[PDB]
């Protein structure tokens, strides 16, 4: 009965870790998206000059 | 004795999910580095022309 309580302490810490690292993955994902159209219009930009 | 075995199934999947996400976020993270100098050198470039 003690070790599944220590395991309870153990899995709660990492489902929350998953729910901060996945938030980081999402936070970086729209940065990936925003930089994708950023390099697109700069490649177009120097072409015209 | 049943449910800490079902918990064992749960935690093994969840640490591997963390380890797959960790290699994905690292795979993204070095391309953060590559796109950081990619935007940089074109600022220098269209400026010169």
UniProtKB/Swiss-Prot annotation, chains A, B:
Naturally occurring in which organism (per UniProt): Gallus gallus (Chicken)
**Which tissues express it?**
Neuronal and non-neuronal cells of the brain.
Function statement = Processive actin-based motor that can move in large steps approximating the 36-nm pseudo-repeat of the actin filament. Can hydrolyze ATP in the presence of actin, which is essential for its function as a motor protein. Involved in melanosome transport. Also mediates the transport of vesicles to the plasma membrane. May also be required for some polarization process involved in dendrite formation.
**Similarity remark:** Belongs to the TRAFAC class myosin-kinesin ATPase superfamily. Myosin family.
Quote the subcellular location field of this record: Golgi apparatus membrane
Q: Which residues of the full protein are shown?
A: 1032 to 1080 of 1829
Q: This protein is called what?
A: Unconventional myosin-Va
Q: How does it assemble?
A: May be a homodimer, which associates with multiple calmodulin or myosin light chains.
